[model samples]
Target: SMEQVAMELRLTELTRLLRSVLDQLQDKDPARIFAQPVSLKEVPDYLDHIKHPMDFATMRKRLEAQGYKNLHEFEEDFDLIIDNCMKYNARDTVFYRAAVRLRDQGGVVLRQARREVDSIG
Candidate 1:
């Protein structure tokens, strides 16, 4: 049961880290730009411009579904939203700025979370 304890603790840590990061992005993205999948009707060229679009809603679903294998996998989803936004929008655009801000804030949380999780392992 000793290993079981650490195993459960690690699970809790991963879930907590993921949920916290999700909230961080959802709360910061006030415009809801990164909140959901891009609307094809609104931005007819979105699919054409960005090959892989990511959003907080999809991330949430993924967390609920299969779940993440590890921190790196979770980080990929987190980074994908930023990358998709930055790639699609101009640097001066609000969307791009939002992505940048999220990247900065998320980066800090990710570093802190990584340290804690590694310590746990």
Candidate 2:
């Protein structure tokens, strides 16, 4: 269960970071805030291809350019998405393709995640 343990640890770390980010932005202008879609409902297929959650680092770095500082934060968010995919027993082919796209594209934007999901199937 090393992968699970690693994933759990990563999740914990990211959650902590996300909380900090929220705290820092608590007083900031809401209009300037960036929105990261946490819902993985549309990317169920992609979640299956995510062999390891750590593989999200590349995509996270790409997103950093968009102002997201913590890859860990996104990692945590992705964990929930993956968990949901597993719980729902989503299609492996679809999820795998999405995972590949996300890994290759360097970010998991809503549009990109969907593209990966479609392309993989």
Candidate 3:
């Protein structure tokens, strides 16, 4: 196996991890409420509650723009969606429940990524 230029290799692996994480989040969000930005009309205090708003669309946009330098960076921003949702929504609401589920399942992808990273050359 010839691997003279290694930057491309790492870049590919990085993107693959991010893609998997993003796709998993999208699939887990059944209502697709996390798919787009929260409208001020829908949640009047969203901005007040969430200092930094993030969603699936924004994650996809950032991925396309190569905004993340590595998997760690991507994961950092990725959890914001779940965190914001849980923080803004009451415990009994579906949104908060969904976020909790997302958080738990999201850890699965990260752990899988770690295993892959450890096994990779």
Q: Pick by lDDT: which candidate is best?
A: 1
lDDT of 2 at 100: 40
TM-scores of all candidate predictions against the true structure: 0.84, 0.26, 0.83
What is the alpha-carbon lDDT for the whole of candidate 3? 0.81
Q: What is the lDDT of residue 32 in candidate 3?
A: 85
Model 2 lDDT, full chain set: 0.42
What are the lDDT scores of the predictions, listed in order? 0.83, 0.42, 0.81
Residues 1-121, candidate 3: write the lDDT tens digits.
Answer: 3573577667767777778768976887888878998898978987888999989998898887767767777777878988898888899999999888888877877788767765773
Error of 2 at 29 (Å): 3.9
**Measured by C-alpha RMSD in angstroms, how accurate is candidate 3?**
3.1
lDDT of 3 at 74: 76
Candidate 3 local lDDT, residue 38: 89
Candidate 2 at residue 33, lDDT?
Answer: 16
Index of the highest-TM-score prediction:
1
Candidate 1 ranges with C-alpha deviation above 4 Å: 1-13
Report the lDDT of model 3 for residue 1: 39
TM-score of 2: 0.26
The predictions' CA RMSDs to the true structure, in order, are: 2.6, 15.4, 3.1
